[PDB]
Scaffold this active site. Structure first.
Site, mmCIF file in Angstrom:
data_model
loop_
_atom_site.group_PDB
_atom_site.id
_atom_site.type_symbol
_atom_site.label_atom_id
_atom_site.label_comp_id
_atom_site.label_asym_id
_atom_site.label_seq_id
_atom_site.Cartn_x
_atom_site.Cartn_y
_atom_site.Cartn_z
ATOM 1 N N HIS A 115 0.911 -0.956 -0.091
ATOM 2 C CA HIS A 115 0.226 0.198 0.148
ATOM 3 C C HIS A 115 0.932 1.249 -0.088
ATOM 4 O O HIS A 115 0.230 2.174 -0.568
ATOM 5 C CB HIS A 115 -0.832 0.028 1.595
ATOM 6 C CG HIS A 115 -1.431 0.754 1.294
ATOM 7 N ND1 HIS A 115 -2.968 1.461 0.895
ATOM 8 C CD2 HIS A 115 -1.357 2.276 1.719
ATOM 9 C CE1 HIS A 115 -3.424 2.579 1.020
ATOM 10 N NE2 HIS A 115 -2.441 3.128 2.205
ATOM 11 N N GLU A 116 1.477 1.211 0.781
ATOM 12 C CA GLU A 116 2.706 2.367 0.920
ATOM 13 C C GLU A 116 3.450 2.872 -0.660
ATOM 14 O O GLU A 116 3.470 4.005 -0.972
ATOM 15 C CB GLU A 116 3.638 2.651 2.073
ATOM 16 C CG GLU A 116 2.836 2.515 3.187
ATOM 17 C CD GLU A 116 2.278 3.072 3.732
ATOM 18 O OE1 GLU A 116 2.434 4.369 3.244
ATOM 19 O OE2 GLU A 116 0.621 3.185 4.253
ATOM 20 N N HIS A 119 1.929 4.703 -3.145
ATOM 21 C CA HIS A 119 1.893 6.333 -3.366
ATOM 22 C C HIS A 119 3.440 6.149 -3.681
ATOM 23 O O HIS A 119 3.646 7.424 -4.172
ATOM 24 C CB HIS A 119 1.914 6.370 -1.655
ATOM 25 C CG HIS A 119 0.572 6.242 -0.116
ATOM 26 N ND1 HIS A 119 -0.512 7.283 -1.303
ATOM 27 C CD2 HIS A 119 -0.130 5.470 0.035
ATOM 28 C CE1 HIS A 119 -1.183 7.430 -0.206
ATOM 29 N NE2 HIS A 119 -1.563 5.829 0.606
ATOM 30 N N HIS A 125 -5.372 7.682 -3.113
ATOM 31 C CA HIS A 125 -6.253 7.330 -2.667
ATOM 32 C C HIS A 125 -7.517 6.306 -3.301
ATOM 33 O O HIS A 125 -7.636 7.864 -3.732
ATOM 34 C CB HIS A 125 -6.562 7.048 -0.775
ATOM 35 C CG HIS A 125 -5.667 7.436 0.400
ATOM 36 N ND1 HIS A 125 -5.932 7.721 1.165
ATOM 37 C CD2 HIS A 125 -5.144 6.075 0.488
ATOM 38 C CE1 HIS A 125 -4.857 7.302 1.880
ATOM 39 N NE2 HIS A 125 -4.861 6.588 1.611
HETATM 40 ZN ZN ZN Z 1 -1.992 5.633 2.661
#
Ligand code: ZN
Ligand code: CA
Ligand code: CA
Ligand code: CA
Ligand code: ZN
Length: 161
Positions: A115-116, A119, A125
């Site tokens: 998930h990171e 980014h 998101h």
């Molecule tokens: Zn996040």
């Protein structure tokens, strides 16, 4: 309208470790997290052991020197910066948490890292509840990327060769 990396060759280095897991298992959970993105794009990730890397990996608690504090057990889990020089791309994980590979009790380092890293590549998101990029953490034993995630990362770097 958005910032992304200039070429598909990105380097990374694990400069800090956590006491909760064996170092070899940590290295594995992080590599597996990168692959989820490299399997659907032309992106390539190379690990280095000396000098500074494009994506510096670390652990910390409360203020750890970046203006964006953590908060003890539970609550926030981790955070990462958008594609950029210096700190851009860096991924930090909160060590007041118990890291595991899910199950017994703790948070899956493999899941939070995947998930990171979305980014650090340039993703925001998603409104899709089933997406990896959703703001909330949810454990699942058999992980798979949603169409929503695949559609967003390929928009930025194209599809897999
Ligand atoms: Zn996040
Ligand atoms: Ca926390
Ligand atoms: Ca960086
Ligand atoms: Ca810990
Ligand atoms: Zn930080």
């Amino acid at each position: 309208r958005k910032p992304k990396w200039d070429k598909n060759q990105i380097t990374y280095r694990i400069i800090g470790y956590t006491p909760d897991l064996d170092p070899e298992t940590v290295d594995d959970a992080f590599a597996r997290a990168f692959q989820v993105w490299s399997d659907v794009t032309p992106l390539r990730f190379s690990r280095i052991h000396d000098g500074e890397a494009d994506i510096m990996i670390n652990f910390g608690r409360w203020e750890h020197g970046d203006g964006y504090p953590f908060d003890g057990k539970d609550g926030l889990l981790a955070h990462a910066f958008a594609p950029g020089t210096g700190v851009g791309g860096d991924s930090h994980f909160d060590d007041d948490e118990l890291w595991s590979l899910g199950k017994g009790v703790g948070y899956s380092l493999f899941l939070v890292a995947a998930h990171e890293f979305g980014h650090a590549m340039g993703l925001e998101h998603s409104q899709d509840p089933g997406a990896l990029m959703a703001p909330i953490y949810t454990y699942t034993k058999n992980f798979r990327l949603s169409q929503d995630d695949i559609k967003g990362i390929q928009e930025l770097y194209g599809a897999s060769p």
